[PDB]
Amino acid sequence: TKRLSVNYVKGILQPTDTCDIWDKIWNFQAKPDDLLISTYPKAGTTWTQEIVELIQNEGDVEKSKRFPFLEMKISGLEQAHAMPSPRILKTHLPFHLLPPSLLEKNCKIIYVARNPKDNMVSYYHFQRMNKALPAPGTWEEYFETFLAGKVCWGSWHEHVKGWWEAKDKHRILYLFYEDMKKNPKHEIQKLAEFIGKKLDDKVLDKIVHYTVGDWKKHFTVAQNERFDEDYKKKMTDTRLTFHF
């Protein structure tokens, strides 16, 4: 499949059909009970959405009863527009580019961050499959492209940091993909509680049943030391912190 056009919009690479609708995305109309799931690409968006659906129903069979990406257009705006409330919305936007209605209405946002080395590997494969995304080049090229943030939705570093800095003054639950992998029950309960559910010592277990390090096989040691030196320079407010 031939690849589609990708261009800078407000400082980040995006699919050109996204770019073509920027003022529509920006002017997105949120509702107070909207729940937004925000992640860098391949940082757990689908997984988090499933857990959230399940949280909202608790019962696994009535869940086939509702997904739109604010920014996307093959559009996320249209599917959002015609969805009943409470809506579950998705985005890969960096925090400073979030449609302002989402903050004016004080909607609950769940951000999920993933360690950048596994995220780089996943995003590399994603770009290999997805026509709407730029050609990733070889792995060795891609490593440098990602390190520089020359990918859709911008630098991973800017992304996670911007969202982390936001959590103080905006209604954001900041989760780590690795924590969800290690201690799901603990994370599902945090998520439940953020969303307003006082759930059960045993409803958790149903969702826990029903719903890291791999990057080491892909990075050379040289790539790794270069990555870490770069990271140390970009990431200087070390309350923010990842398991690798």
Numbering used by the authors: 8 to 73, 80 to 87, 92 to 228, 262 to 294
Question: How is this structure described in the published paper?
Answer:
Cytosolic sulfotransferases (SULTs) comprise a family of enzymes that catalyze the transfer of a sulfonate group from 3′-phosphoadenosine 5′-phosphosulfate (PAPS) to an acceptor group of the substrate. In doing so, SULTs modulate the activities of a large array of small endogenous and foreign chemicals, including drugs, toxic compounds, steroid hormones, and neurotransmitters. As expected, all SULTs share the same basic fold: a central four-stranded parallel β-sheet surrounded by α-helices and three loops that are often disordered (dashed lines) in the absence of PAP and/or substrate. The crystal structures of SULT1C3 bound to PAP, apo SULT1C2, a ternary complex of SULT1C2 bound to PAP, and the environmental toxin, pentachlorophenol (PCP), and SULT4A1 were solved at 3.2, 2.0, 1.8, and 2.2 Å, respectively.
In some cases, partial stabilization can be attributed to molecular packing in the crystal, as in, for example, the stabilization of α14 (green) in apo SULT1C2. Helices α4, α5, and αı5, and loops α5-α6 and α15-α16 are ordered only in the ternary complex, but not in the apo SULT1C2 structure. The degree of disorder and the exact conformation of these loops vary considerably across the family, but in general, the presence of ligands (cofactor and/or substrate) is coupled with increased order, namely, the formation of helices α4-α5 (gold), and α14-α15 (green). Thus, SULT1B1 and 1C2 appear to be much more closely related in terms of structure and activity than their global sequences would indicate.
